[PDB]
Design a protein around this ligand. Structure first.
Ligand SMILES: [Ca+2]
Ligand SMILES: [Ca+2]
Ligand SMILES: [Ca+2]
Ligand SMILES: [Ca+2]
Ligand SMILES: [Zn+2]
Length: 316
């Protein structure tokens, strides 16, 4: 839209109030004209035709229980964009202020949300297994991170590489949840995964095995399904990535933590300046070790911790 940037206001999936950036012209559309070449959001209309119709509001106030996904799936994108900019110095996913489009209410009770290649997508959850996946910021960045991983590495979404793509998308998906310091945990989607059981999550990074995810490269799932096990064997890298930030004695291997804002810059550099489509775990090791060297010389604890943290989860 050609229009006048303002600020409206609306309510998340988990009902927080939050000023949003919206674009008046006739109506108020959910076009944050402030970051990048814009961050747009479209009503899918519980249907599949993408990206749907750009979101519009009449009074510029989004509190209706149909807007909760759009808004949460909007505020959270600009917080992510914020991150990648206000740390890593990256301008939207492409790197050159690409326009972050988003669709919400994509199909009936679709228990999922993804990067379609062009754009982030979001369901409303079935209402047993999920609530609107806009609702989690964890969820937004992961699926946005996927796009970064497109326009940097291009790690192909099967086998080890695939397990990496998601892992990154777990890794910066957390490092983004800690940016906003919004009940920040090393967990994946508790806030909007199963309302009927507060105190759980789809995945974990501190302990994946709790949700059927391996925490070593001895327990690496092979079979053709999950595209080799992308949404599974990730768990190895979740642990690795996690262990580094935090530290701990995994299968008897005394790692030493370096905080989450030294995990970022490493995975990011590796993500951006070291990885390939065809990047197995072992190379991820080389890539994280190397990064550390660039970022903190070899004889630093950083290179030493990465080596330790991959030495834990069975990667050489
Ligand atoms: Ca309204
Ligand atoms: Ca949380
Ligand atoms: Ca979380
Ligand atoms: Ca839950
Ligand atoms: Zn994903």
């Amino acid at each position: 839209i050609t229009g006048t940037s303002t600020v409206g206001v609306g309510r998340g999936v988990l009902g927080d109030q939050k000023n949003i950036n919206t674009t008046y012209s006739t109506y108020y559309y959910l076009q944050d004209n402030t970051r990048g070449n814009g961050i747009f959001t479209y009503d899918a209309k519980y249907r599949t035709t993408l990206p749907g119709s750009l979101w519009a509001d009449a009074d510029n106030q989004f509190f209706a229980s149909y807007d909760a996904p759009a808004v949460d799936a909007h505020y959270y994108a600009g917080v992510t964009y914020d991150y990648y900019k206000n740390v890593h110095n990256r301008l939207s996913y492409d790197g050159n202020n690409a326009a972050i489009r988003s669709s919400v209410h994509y199909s009936q009770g679709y228990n999922n949300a993804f990067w379609n290649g062009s754009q982030m997508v979001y369901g409303d959850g079935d209402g047993q297994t999920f609530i609107p996946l806009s609702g989690g910021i964890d969820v937004v960045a992961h699926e946005l991170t996927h796009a970064v991983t497109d326009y940097t590495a291009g790690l192909i979404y099967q086998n080890e590489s695939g397990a990496i793509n998601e892992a990154i998308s777990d890794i910066f998906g957390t490092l983004v949840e800690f940016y906003a310091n919004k009940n920040p945990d090393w967990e994946i989607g508790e806030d909007v995964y199963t309302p009927g059981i507060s105190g759980d999550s789809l995945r974990s990074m501190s302990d994946p095995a709790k949700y059927g995810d391996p925490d070593h490269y001895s327990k690496r799932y092979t079979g053709t399904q999950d595209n080799g096990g992308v949404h599974i064997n990730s768990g190895i890298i979740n642990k690795a990535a996690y262990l580094i930030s935090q530290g701990g004695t995994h299968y008897g291997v005394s790692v030493v933590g370096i905080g989450r804002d030294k995990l970022g810059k490493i995975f990011y550099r590796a993500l951006t300046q070291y990885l390939t489509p065809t990047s197995n775990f072992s190379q991820l090791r080389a890539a994280a070790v190397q990064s550390a060297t660039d970022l903190y010389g070899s004889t630093s604890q950083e290179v030493a911790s990465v080596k330790q943290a991959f030495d834990a989860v069975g990667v050489k």
